[PDB]
Structure 1
Amino acid sequence: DRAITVFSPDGHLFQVEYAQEAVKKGSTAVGVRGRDIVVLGVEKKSVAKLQDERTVRKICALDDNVCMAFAGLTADARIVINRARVECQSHRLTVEDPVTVEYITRYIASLKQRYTQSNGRRPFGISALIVGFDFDGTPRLYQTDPSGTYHAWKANAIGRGAKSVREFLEKNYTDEAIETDDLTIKLVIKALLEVVQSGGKNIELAVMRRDQSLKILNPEEIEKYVAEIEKEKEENE
């Protein structure tokens, strides 16, 4: 019938709905709060022997205290990061205080809403999600639907297999299991590990320790944390 940016006879916005269903094509993305550290992972499983793994860039920083991850179209996501990064540098230029996570998420949501508006612009079929420590200590996580909206979540769980991983997170999202940085990281694992095989090195985790720079976990330490998760799984017969 009609699949353009106009209201349908039953309501809704079918082009926006199609964009919102396009995130399913992509990859899983999990991340949590904890007042000590925000950690988010992607778990990409596609690397040929001839492609360099440096330029996958599934997680990227904005202002060394804000980082975002992919779920959906990669080119649209990269354009979003470029524009958002420009806007964070602008909001660092004016208003000399560093950017807040809510402000940049609001800007990203506003850009997505603007692109959904009018028939000319394709509605940016990317679902972004942003973590990071604010200026006033508190680390926060917001998840932005492609249409126009952002929501502050304790767990994001966006991408392929989003429903199952979100159910697992909300099932056992224990703050006592959050506590320490290591506990937080090991809670993100065994939750993202649940998605697909996750066997050798598929997990691609990211770390933001309060005021430290964006930490990308080394593969050997990732395997160490996987072994610790296995040890916790053991002795539970």
Structure 2
Amino acid sequence: ITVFSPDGHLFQVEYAQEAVKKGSTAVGVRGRDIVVLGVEKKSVAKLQDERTVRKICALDDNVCMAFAGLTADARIVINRARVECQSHRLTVEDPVTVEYITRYIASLKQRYTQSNGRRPFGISALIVGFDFDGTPRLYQTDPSGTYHAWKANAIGRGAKSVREFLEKNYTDEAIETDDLTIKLVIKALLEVVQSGGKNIELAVMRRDQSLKILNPEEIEKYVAEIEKEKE
């Protein structure tokens, strides 16, 4: 946990990375006037409501995040992040910046991965949102605690494959408007998982709006037309 490998790798952070790799594919796109998140779903939920398994959440109104890995540590980090957002809104009385909360989460992960009395978080928080001036944002922390801004990131199951596919696909022409960003995110998710449908958990957030969990009916119709475009 606090010991380095001969090559200079902390074992705990690498194990957390493996846990993240076993997690779902959190996919996001930094669109202008619109930020789109997307996370692979294990369907199931035959007797369980989708409300409690919502991997994509809203830290306040101007920030929404998704994770990939263990869901318990994800829940606790989400709780801490939203508490920090509320505390900032109370004291400073300003909308919390995506950079601010991303740095807070990265610092928390760094603290938990440094001390040997506690294990690192086994998740990678993919954070999106709009700042005070309305600039779209896209960030991705790691168990180590390295927060990095991205144009369109994708972390989780087969992270590298989806990331390179999206890099090949991501272009300003594809980032224009918002429907196009939705198509990009859905395409990345479908590339990850061929089944699609219920597995595609889609969330969108606009410039001056809150996080809108896109309804499954909207998700499937976008998939259908995406299929139509391919033919």
TM-score normalised by length of structure 1: 0.93
Q: Distance in 2 between matches of 1:159 and 1:199?
A: 16
Larger helix proportion, structure 1 or 2? 2
Query: Does the Cα contact within 8 Å between 1:5 and 1:16 map onto a contact in 2?
Result: no
**Partners of 1:197 and 1:183 in 2: CA distance:** 20
Deviation at 1:62, TM superposition (A): 0.5
Bigger mean CA deviation after superposition, 206-215 or 187-196:
187-196
- CA deviation after TM superposition for structure 1 residue 73, in Å: 0.7
Q: Number of paired residues?
A: 231
| Residues 138 and 47 of structure 1, relative CA distance in 2, 3 Å threshold | same
CA contact (8 A) 2:28 2:36 kept: yes
Please report how far the alpha carbon of residue 198 of structure 1 lies from its aligned counterpart in structure 2 after TM superposition: 3.0
Greater CA deviation, 7-16 or 69-78? 7-16
Counterparts in 2 of 1:149 and 1:199: CA distance versus 1, 3 Å: closer
Higher share in strand: 2
Are 2:169 and 2:184, in contact at CA under 8 Å, matched by a contact in 1?
no
CA distance in 1, matches of 2:110, 2:199: 33
Contact 1:27–1:71 (CA under 8 A) maintained in structure 2: yes
Q: Which runs of 5+ in 1 are unaligned?
A: none
Asked if the contact 1:131–1:140 (Cα under 8 Å) also holds between the matched residues in 2, the reply is: yes
In 2, Cα distance between equivalents of 1:123 and 1:134? 29
2:43/2:198 contact within 8 Å kept: no
For 1:25 and 1:169, locate their aligned partners in 2 and report how far apart those are by CA, in whole Å: 20
In the TM superposition, what whole-angstrom CA distance separates every residue of 1:81-125 from its partner, at most 9, and x where no partner exists? 001111111111222211000000000000000001111011111
TM superposition shift of 1:199 = 3.5
Larger-gyration structure (1/2): 1
Contact persistence 1:32–1:141 (CA under 8 A): yes
Alpha-carbon separation, structure 2, partners of 1:223 and 1:7: 47
Q: CA deviation at 1:209?
A: 0.9
CA distance in 1, matches of 2:144, 2:172: 31
User: Hey, what's the Cα distance between the residues in 2 that align with 1:55 and 1:80?
Assistant: 16
Between 1:31-40 and 1:193-202, the stretch displaced more is: 193-202
CA shift digits 1:158-214 (9 cap, x unpaired): 100211110111112111121111111111111211112233322110010111111
Pick the aligned partner of 2:16 from 19, 33, 36.
19
Q: Is contact 2:32–2:177 with CA below 8 Å preserved after alignment?
A: no
Kindly indicate whether the alpha-carbon contact (under 8 Å) linking 1:43 and 1:198 is maintained by their aligned counterparts in 2. Answer: no
Shift of residue 144, structure 1, vs aligned partner = 0.3
Give 1:232 shift. 1.2
User: Is the Cα–Cα contact under 8 Å of residues 33 and 39 in structure 1 kept in the other structure?
Assistant: yes
Find the counterpart in structure 1 of residue 171 from structure 2: 174
Deviation at 1:48, TM superposition (A): 3.8
Displacement, 1:42? Answer: 0.7
Contact 2:23 2:69 in 1 (8 A): yes
Query: Once the 2 structures are TM-superposed, how far is the Cα of residue 43 of structure 1 from its aligned partner?
Result: 2.3
- What CA distance in whole angstroms lies between the structure 1 residues aligned with 2:183 and 2:195? 14
> Any idea what SS the aligned residue of 2:144 has?
coil
**Cα displacement (A) at 1:45:** 2.3
4+ residue stretches of structure 1 with deviation over 4 A? none
Distance 1:9 1:190, change over 3 A: closer
Provide TM-score, normalisation by structure 2.
0.96
Residue 190 of structure 2: SS of its match in structure 1? coil
CA RMSD in angstroms, aligned pairs only: 1.3
In structure 2, what is the Cα distance between the partners aligned to 1:194 and 1:207? 19
Which of 14, 18, 28 is matched with 1:31 structurally? 28
